[PDB]
Amino acid sequence: AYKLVLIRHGESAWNLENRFSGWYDADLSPAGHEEAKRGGQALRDAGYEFDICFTSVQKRAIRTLWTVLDAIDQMWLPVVRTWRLNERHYGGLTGLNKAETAAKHGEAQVKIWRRSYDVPPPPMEPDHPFYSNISKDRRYADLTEDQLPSCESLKDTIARALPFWNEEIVPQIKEGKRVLIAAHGNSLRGIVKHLEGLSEEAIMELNLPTGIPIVYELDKNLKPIKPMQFLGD
Amino acid sequence: AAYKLVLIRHGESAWNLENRFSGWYDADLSPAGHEEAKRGGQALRDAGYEFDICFTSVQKRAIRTLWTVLDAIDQMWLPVVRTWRLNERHYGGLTGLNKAETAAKHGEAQVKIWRRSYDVPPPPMEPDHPFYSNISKDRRYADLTEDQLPSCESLKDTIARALPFWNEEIVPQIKEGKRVLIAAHGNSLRGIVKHLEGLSEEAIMELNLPTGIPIVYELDKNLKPIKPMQFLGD
Ligand SMILES: [Cl-]
């Protein structure tokens, strides 16, 4: 029975998790860092070992991972980064709070964007402060013209995240390698949705705790044997 | 030039302070080691360096140096490749001993001979050595063959296992135009410098790279330096 571990990063700087931090490359706040420390410690005490790690190309996730590997004394592990495990690209909404968002786009569009699974937010306009910051960052230089997102619904994020899981992670697991994924709420959501066969409703309703190792026991077809387990107290 | 290549030796380890031979022992940085790496990274930032891929050992002093540099230059998103082939030289039975214990046990003559020879290994690290299980039974070396797993290395041995990796994994990256950063150890780096500059065995033993300092090569189409290595900092 394969063991799989996930972990969502915690709090980002300047309250950005509550401001559609999206593809903006926010660092952890000291608190989010400490949360990663607790997660690390929990993993250390349970005596978990991994053989390979996956993460996004966003620094908050990466730092969460570094913190974990440090805590569990497994810094020598192979690590693979990918935009495919990135947070949702919240487009034009990026950096904005609820109020700012509604003021810019109206209550209607806004509540639609909240309640939906497959309706994207509007894309970054040239006057948006994160415009070139994100869309011209060389970390996405390899992406095709039709592959570089400008805005993503939950469904989009999940769609660009699933093939990486399929092509890159699933092979490691079948070979018996113990996998740690350090990522983001929505991409992790992609994975959990695939694993437990949840509906759109269900997935939008689920909030994965931050900073806490999430454990899965998987059968030979990679299907969960139990509900997800948390490590700590 | 034609290609830019940056090397950096890990900052001061906790054992470097105690003057203990580490070799394949996984000693962590000292706080001063950390600040050394931080400074190196700050220097790499102030000069505007951008990388595309990173190579390092499977030893946390090198790895931590790397992390600190990538934090400093804001490039934590870069691909990072670890290999034991860039590990510190395996110091065999001297592992865990200090210079005093070493002198006391073997004599000053012999220790000299050791650190002045390119081709002579230290005594092997045998199964009753205090660090045998720590190093040899470490799961991070599980995929090594019997032949590949040292009980000890001369510089020539270390170099011999480091270069195939350079040839097979790093050279292809450089010739593709990828800007490469290698965060490793004095002796494995020595392997790389000796190859680049074609130094003699004699004129590589005398070569001492400091902890924590970015080293720059500008190479050409033959991956040969156009100019001598530049140190980076204040
Ligand atoms: Cl890494």
Swiss-Prot record, chain B:
Q: SMART domains annotated for this entry?
A: PGAM
Report the SUPFAM superfamilies cross-referenced here.
Answer: Phosphoglycerate mutase-like (SSF53254)
Sites bearing N6-acetyllysine, chain numbering: K105
Q: Which reaction does it catalyse?
A: (2R)-2-phosphoglycerate = (2R)-3-phosphoglycerate; (2R)-3-phospho-glyceroyl phosphate = (2R)-2,3-bisphosphoglycerate + H(+)
Name a single GO cellular component: membrane
Post-translational modification, as annotated: Acetylation increases catalytic activity. Under glucose restriction SIRT1 levels dramatically increase and it deacetylates the enzyme.
Residues the record annotates as the site (Transition state stabilizer) are H185
Q: Which residues form the active site?
A: H10 (tele-phosphohistidine intermediate), E88 (proton donor/acceptor)
Q: Which UniProt keywords apply?
A: Acetylation, Glycolysis, Hydrolase, Isomerase, Phosphoprotein
Q: Does this UniProt record's set of keywords contain Protein transport?
A: no
Q: Which GO molecular function entries does the Swiss-Prot or TrEMBL record give?
A: bisphosphoglycerate mutase activity; hydrolase activity; phosphoglycerate mutase activity; protein kinase binding
Tell me the residues on which Phosphotyrosine occurs: Y25
Give the first-level EC class, as a single word: isomerase
- UniProt-annotated binding residues for substrate: 9-16, 22-23, 61, 88-91, 99, 115-116, 186-187
Which CDD domains does the record associate with it? HP_PGM_like
Record's function text: Catalyzes the interconversion of 2-phosphoglycerate and 3-phosphoglyceratea crucial step in glycolysis, by using 2,3-bisphosphoglycerate. Also catalyzes the interconversion of (2R)-2,3-bisphosphoglycerate and (2R)-3-phospho-glyceroyl phosphate.
Quaternary assembly: Homodimer.
Q: Which family does it belong to?
A: Belongs to the phosphoglycerate mutase family. BPG-dependent PGAM subfamily.
NCBIfam families from the entry? Answer: pgm_1, PRK14115.1
State the name under which the record lists this protein.
Phosphoglycerate mutase 1
Please name the source species. Answer: Homo sapiens
Phylogenetic lineage: Eukaryota, Metazoa, Chordata, Craniata, Vertebrata
